[PDB]
Design a protein around this ligand. Structure first.
Ligand code: H5S
Length: 557
């Protein structure tokens, strides 16, 4: 029961790949230690192939089936609708990979007759054929990291026509079912503000709180055929149109369970029998399966008063402590159970008794003070990776502007405000690109966002205090300064100086640019303004935001 089998054909690139950090006239203003930053390339795909390839054994017990039964009960309450071809098309990102059958993403988005004709013929084939494996492409991802080198992650995805069909059959399901089945434990429903609030309240709810994150080693490759059939049975609990049921059976049999793996040059690379990382159901499937296995493992480990927070395979548990030594033993049994369920650990879970020492979705809780001196909890992270990616993005336009994603989700943090906002607004002013819409990915979905709308977006996800936090914690200040020394990033005093300039330059522009000056950089001046609610923030359609996760799912808003 191997996760993959291979032919020896290489996982090839589409385009030229750079691994070394590109340097331009802006690079040194952000980061001097250039040799510490690299991008992954297809050249490391062979090592990843080794890592993701292993035998899965699964031992399923009554705790597993009990939880599953409970999950299906909740799933039966869901009604989902089929999308029209045209609805599905409009959810397609403008730069999504083109079909093999003579059309591309902009063809799909424009409802070009050729595209829509192909999609109708794909749909009809799903309805008629529930057996034939569907072809997928396997590609190496190019992502940027700091040293101390990771091999490239793999992405496996079916043809554009199929992807539109997935949307038609399952978009409403994957959008609505996770929150119904998992309620408050479903992470992708929450803005950052809502997530910190859930974490802090959950911690406070316990008499003696203990918490841990569980890291599954290569979660996608631990997902078995059983797991994928169980996912399908959950989806099938929904109130669905007859064509939707047939299409979901067909996609499950022909695509989700497994299939052939073709490189960008058309050569067969092998065969997958685990989760495809690049399908509509990757996030929803991962979340449900992670939740099922973890909920049953909690019961196996007799952890008391378990509260879970699950975003795909990212799992945090907060529960009642039994003292340190017993907690350690309980975690060992939790892991044993997970392992029997085919989700063994990368790093062994560590129990934590301070909420701020728990990392989940790569973030920890920390504390600052708002304008009134009130303590405010917010989410932050070690800024090394964000800054290494910012440095790549200073010299190269990328399909995913991670800095924008980071300014949005980590707006309240010391490092996003002082460094990211300052640096990137300086660049945008110089190139007259304040108004130019840019793509970023939040909870796996693509969003086209104009930088001038940042203040309103930040207000809506975080509140006005995002523009007012001060008196950050010693350990957080210390982590940021340390990171800046490691990377050769100028110290925070330099950034304050530049922000004052950027702020002025922005106010000179007037209008929405001045509003950016006023809100984003009020921390940089000594005569602070009073920041009042933004009129445009009440008008923003932030629907689409924080309903669900869609990593690998080819979704655009
Ligand atoms: C303040 C704050 C900051 C973050 C950091 N972020 C993430 O972790 C993801 C994320 N996107 S995803 O859906 O691709 C995904 C994420 C996290 C874990 C996981 C996944 C997706 N999966 S999967 C492949 O199983 O769906 C693995 C687990 C994000 O979009 C943001 C980011 C913009 C800064 C990157 C998160 C919540 C939050 F409140």
């Amino acid at each position: 029961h191997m996760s993959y089998t291979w032919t020896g054909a290489l996982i090839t690139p589409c385009a030229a790949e750079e691994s070394k950090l590109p340097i331009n006239a802006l690079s040194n203003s952000l980061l001097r230690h250039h040799n510490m930053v690299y991008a992954t390339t297809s050249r490391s795909a062979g090592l990843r192939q080794k890592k993701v390839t292993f035998d899965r054994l699964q031992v399923l017990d009554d705790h597993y089936r009990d939880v599953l039964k409970e999950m299906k009960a909740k799933a039966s309450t869901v009604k989902a609708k089929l999308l029209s071809v045209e609805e599905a098309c409009k959810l397609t990102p403008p730069h999504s990979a083109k079909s093999k059958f003579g059309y591309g993403a902009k063809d799909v988005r424009n409802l070009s007759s050729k595209a829509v004709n192909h999609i109708h013929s794909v749909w009809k084939d799903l309805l008629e054929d529930t057996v034939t494996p569907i072809d997928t492409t396997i590609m190496a991802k190019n992502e940027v990291f700091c040293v101390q080198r990771k091999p490239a992650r793999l992405i496996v995805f079916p043809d554009l026509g199929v992807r539109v069909c997935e949307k038609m059959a399952l978009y409403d399901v994957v959008s609505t079912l996770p929150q119904v089945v998992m309620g408050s434990s479903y992470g992708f429903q929450y803005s950052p503000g809502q997530r910190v609030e859930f974490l802090v309240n959950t911690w406070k709810s316990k008499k003696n709180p203990m918490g841990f994150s569980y890291d599954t080693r290569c979660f996608d490759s631990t997902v078995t055929e059983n797991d994928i059939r169980v996912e399908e049975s959950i989806y099938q609990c929904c109130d669905l149109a007859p064509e939707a049921r047939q299409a979901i059976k067909s996609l499950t049999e022909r695509l989700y369970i497994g299939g052939p793996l073709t490189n960008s040059k058309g050569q067969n690379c092998g065969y997958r029998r685990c989760r495809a990382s690049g399908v509509l159901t990757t996030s929803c499937g991962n979340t449900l399966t992670c939740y099922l296995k973890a909920s049953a493992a909690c019961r196996a480990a007799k952890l008391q008063d378990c509260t879970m927070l699950v975003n795909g395979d990212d799992l945090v548990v907060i529960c009642e402590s039994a003292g340190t030594q017993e907690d350690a033993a309980s975690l060992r049994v939790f892991t044993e159970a997970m392992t029997r369920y085919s989700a063994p650990p990368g790093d062994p879970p560590q129990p934590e008794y301070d909420l701020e020492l728990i990392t989940s979705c790569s973030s920890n809780v920390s504390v600052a003070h708002d304008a009134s001196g009130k303590r405010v909890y917010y989410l932050t992270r070690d800024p090394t990776t964000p800054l290494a990616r910012a440095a790549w993005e200073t010299a190269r336009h990328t399909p995913v502007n991670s800095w924008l994603g980071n300014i949005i989700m980590y707006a309240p943090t010391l490092w996003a405000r002082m460094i990211l906002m300052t640096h990137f607004f300086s660049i945008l002013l110089a190139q007259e690109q304040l108004e130019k819409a840019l793509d970023c990915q939040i909870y796996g979905a693509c969003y086209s966002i104009e930088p001038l709308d940042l203040p309103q977006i930040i207000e809506r996800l975080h509140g006005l205090s995002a523009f007012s936090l001060h008196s950050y914690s010693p350990g957080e200040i210390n982590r940021v300064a340390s990171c800046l020394r490691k990377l050769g990033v100028p110290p925070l005093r330099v950034w304050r100086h530049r922000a004052r300039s950027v702020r002025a330059r922005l106010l000179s522009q007037g209008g929405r640019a001045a509003t950016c000056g006023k809100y984003l950089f009020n921390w940089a001046v000594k005569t602070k303004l009073k920041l009042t609610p933004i009129p445009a923030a009440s008008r923003l359609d932030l629907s689409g935001w924080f309903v669900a996760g869609y990593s690998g799912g080819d979704i655009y808003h």
